[PDB]
Amino acid sequence: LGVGGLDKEFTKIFRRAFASRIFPPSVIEKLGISHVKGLLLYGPPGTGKTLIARKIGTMLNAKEPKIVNGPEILSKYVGSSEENIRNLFKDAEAEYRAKGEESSLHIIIFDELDSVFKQRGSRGDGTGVGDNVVNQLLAKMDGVDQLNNILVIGMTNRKDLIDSALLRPGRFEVQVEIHLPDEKGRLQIFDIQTKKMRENNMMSDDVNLAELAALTKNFSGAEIEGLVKSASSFAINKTVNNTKDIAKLKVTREDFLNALNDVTPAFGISEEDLKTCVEGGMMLYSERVNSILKNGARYVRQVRESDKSRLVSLLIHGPAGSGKTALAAEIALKSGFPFIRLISPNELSGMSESAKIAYIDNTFRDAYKSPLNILVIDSLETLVDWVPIGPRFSNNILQMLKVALKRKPPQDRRLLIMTTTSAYSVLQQMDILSCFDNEIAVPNMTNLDELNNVMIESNFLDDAGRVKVINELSRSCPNFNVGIKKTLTNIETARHDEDPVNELVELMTQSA
Amino acid sequence: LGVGGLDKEFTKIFRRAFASRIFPPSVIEKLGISHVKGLLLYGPPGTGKTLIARKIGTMLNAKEPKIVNGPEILSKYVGSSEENIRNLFKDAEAEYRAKGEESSLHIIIFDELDSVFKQRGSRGDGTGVGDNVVNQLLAKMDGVDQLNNILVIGMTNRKDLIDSALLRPGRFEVQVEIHLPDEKGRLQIFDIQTKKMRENNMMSDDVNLAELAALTKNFSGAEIEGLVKSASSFAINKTVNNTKDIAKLKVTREDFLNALNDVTPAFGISEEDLKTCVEGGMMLYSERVNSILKNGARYVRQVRESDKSRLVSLLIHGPAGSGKTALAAEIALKSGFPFIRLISPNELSGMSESAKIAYIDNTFRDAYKSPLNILVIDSLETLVDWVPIGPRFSNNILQMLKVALKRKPPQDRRLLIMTTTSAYSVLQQMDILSCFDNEIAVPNMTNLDELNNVMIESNFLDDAGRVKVINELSRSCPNFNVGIKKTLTNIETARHDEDPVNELVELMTQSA
Ligand SMILES: Nc1ncnc2c1ncn2[C@@H]1O[C@H](COP(=O)(O)OP(=O)(O)OP(=O)(O)O)[C@@H](O)[C@H]1O
Ligand SMILES: Nc1ncnc2c1ncn2[C@@H]1O[C@H](COP(=O)(O)OP(=O)(O)OP(=O)(O)O)[C@@H](O)[C@H]1O
Ligand SMILES: Nc1ncnc2c1ncn2[C@@H]1O[C@H](COP(=O)(O)OP(=O)(O)O)[C@@H](O)[C@H]1O
Ligand SMILES: Nc1ncnc2c1ncn2[C@@H]1O[C@H](COP(=O)(O)OP(=O)(O)O)[C@@H](O)[C@H]1O
């Protein structure tokens, strides 16, 4: 005991990796079988793998597990690395000659395994550093030097990089996956972490753990440890400057609520980028805008409450300066989904091409590990480096994006994608219009009534003047055609001049 | 005894490689012949090669075979690699001086042979690691230092890489192939594996091995051994938590049936990818769909009960959104074949060009080792990276695929191939249309009756409302042209709205 939220996995591991070790050697001999010598656990970081490995050892009363780290061995000098691997198994070798089939169990943990394979074959074999450890390790548990006391546990974050040679029977025969916890699991983790405080009357009676289990929506276990530590920090600092009356120390609900603002999770919301940069006003100057927002809300609920629709892709298009991005963000912030991210040119500035591919792929990879997700892609045509003189563009990134937009996430998960563009004709010429499930159009302003609404909404000036602007434009140029960004960047400059009324009309004539 | 399914090969090996060692030396000298010093076995892994190697030795009462692993020798430092070969034969050299012609037989096993040749000539010769072992090895069995007590066995999974110089007489004269077992072979392997349970009264009376032999369709030996071990795991875990009344332990049929869900074989069915990703509905909305499914069933039965047709290939083509892939998958799952795989852009994402070529070639190789096989190739034009601005595309992959679609499998095996494409004219220009034997076209929806059927079958809403949609469309736009995918996306997006009828009408008019 000491682990929460992983009952089913625990039963599965114990049935296969350890159950046969409990029985006396006689019956195992009489059945005619041989023990399992490899187990592979995979999943995201900070989720509780090493803890399971450690706690299973305590029931069997084996020795304390030895631990080894991948880059440690790989980074040492060649000769030392070659000599190192033989030093790990010495104790297990000795006890076998001592006691044979009655020997006690020895458990070895191997961490960041994939790092050994993550290199080109030429460098791995010519240098030999990558291949040497793998070969010696397989020799010690499969070949003629077979040693019958050991059990090896390997831990990885990316299963697809492990070579298939290692997965066949006789080597790493059992594989298990660990998931981010759900609400009930987090309730248990909170209990395990606050037990010691609760049992010494150092925790206040206003704390309700069921509510915290609902606020911490997409957290892992390590994050919960951090949250408790920060809460305790509040209570400790309130008394220092070391004083009398330490015996009345107690943590309180306010401490936790303030703690939430200091620990931010991975797999969370990129709040600042969406809120500040992309949204500096929202005003309902026409019926079309309200229509667009209602359609967006439709799609959000559609994704949230159906099992047929687990991938929806949309394209928002229109002229430059119309409003696209701000709309996308506005749809995202009202959703309430736990996971939201955006890919934009700002993030990829200053990189080489290969780096760009790696970044995009890791982002999509991370989107596949939570129950609900949203992704925003900004200005597709710029990510591909389009210039029309050549024309010139990067084909590899285009193919990466083309494949990513159609793939479906695994195991009853679901995501939504929004993308924004200003060069619809180019996308038509590159024939990737078959990826998007629906299209939305954003038009400019073309009636003077809309202008009046915008002026009313931004507190331009009293009615008497706003009438004059419309009257002058009525026969200056009644057929104008301008976006919203420009209109709201001409009102700003007009306000700080000496003749507001005569300045805005001229700027509007010029833009049209 | 201890091996099953390989009687013919046992006879043929014993007749050539060993029969001469039994006779007294007088008669062998008296005929004037010489013993054979090389034997090569090739076949897929986990099929029983080292087993036969060990078992043949115990009849002759030779010394326990020494074993050496290729990459082990190649990965060591250069000096020790050159020195170590000479240590392998030391004992054999000793006994020859000791006793002369009357010595006993010495048997040396060499594993993963092809690895030594799998390198460029420049690196192999300049470094010398690859060439040195080969040269020193041939010296000991062919040259003036010929040693007359040894026998060398080579073991490899790919014969095409071994150089033709080694196979000539005096070196590795005899070559043999190992196959995956057929039904009777599996029936024998089960007996060999379950003997010790049966002889100690630890196996129930309901287990019938003839049924298990028929369920496990493309298993090799190692998978059958793992299957027995997993069933034992079930029987053991049911008591723990180590108790009284261990003596009544017994395995049972339920355990085997449950064990089938835990061991998944190579050369099996990739169920999840075909089932989940590709099929999220199937509804018979017209006569053309019935016709297509019936044609597919026809071809399957053709491939299964004829000797003249050992290779068939089909092309399914039509507009984007028509239904293609889901059809292919539907035809595949109903077939009941043992082996099914598919190649799609998802598996090849993020690879270099050389890696892609290697992956495709390995897949086609793995297809040629079972009686019946199905392959599905999805979105051909995306595999080649087509973009029409240049145009730009990869020529090497195209030539690889063009060769692969005509090659016929060896030795009375047979396969069926299906491929899907949306760019028929592009392939017309590439001139690869001569590879396919038949062509199927999938059309779009063009009648209101079909739409009625689709609405009825998806439970859209009660009849009273269902009639009104058809009424309104009958005079809004009677000549519409839309695929199935977009229809089933508009339906769902109209169920979660406040006025389903108007919303559906507007969307469907826009798509048409
Ligand atoms: N109703 C509205 N719709 C859209 N944007 C609005 C609205 N009201 C105010 N705005 C503001 O107007 C600005 C619109 O500029 P935005 O960056 O979204 O343009 P864009 O279409 O993405 O153009 P670009 O081609 O330059 O990327 C934002 O600051 C947004 O907050
Ligand atoms: N009778 C049917 N025929 C084909 N597809 C059907 C049928 N009934 C339902 N569907 C559904 O139609 C959906 C769309 O089909 P599918 O994904 O195979 O299209 P596609 O031709 O591969 O398109 P793309 O151009 O995107 O590659 C599938 O999810 C399938 O489940
Ligand atoms: N399921 C869990 N229950 C309780 N504590 C957990 C859990 N998962 C992680 N932890 C906390 O995480 C810390 C160690 O996690 P760690 O060993 O880093 O996992 P990983 O295998 O991801 O490295 C411990 O201090 C432990 O309290
Ligand atoms: N044809 C067979 N008959 C009996 N046992 C087999 C057979 N094939 C494989 N096995 C099982 O496989 C194990 C050894 O296979 P292995 O020596 O790894 O063959 P190879 O490595 O040459 O493919 C043994 O435990 C044996 O019980």
Numbering used by the authors:
A (entry chain G), B (entry chain A): 239 to 479, 488 to 758
Give sentences from the paper.
SNARE (soluble N-ethylmaleimide-sensitive factor (NSF) attachment protein receptor) proteins drive membrane fusion at different cell compartments as their core domains zipper into a parallel four-helix bundle. After fusion, these bundles are disassembled by the AAA+ (ATPase associated with diverse cellular activities) protein Sec18/NSF and its adaptor Sec17/α-SNAP to make them available for subsequent rounds of membrane fusion. The disassembly requires multiple ATP hydrolysis events in the presence of Mg2+; as few as six ATP hydrolysis events are sufficient.
We prepared purified wild-type Sec18 in the presence of ATP and Mg2+ in a three-stage procedure that yielded a pure sample used for cryo-EM studies. Two bands were visible in native gels, indicating two oligomeric states. Processing and classification led to three classes, two of which appeared to be heptameric and identical (280,935 particles and 73,253 particles, respectively) and a third class that contained indeterminate density in the D1 ring (70,513 particles). Density for the N domains was not well resolved in any of the classes, presumably because of the conformational flexibility of the N domains without substrate or adaptor present. The D1 pore diameter is 30 Å, larger than that of substrate-bound hexamer, with a diameter of ~11 Å. The substrate-free structures (hexamer and heptamer) are nearly identical (r.m.s.d. = 0.48 Å) to the substrate-released structures.
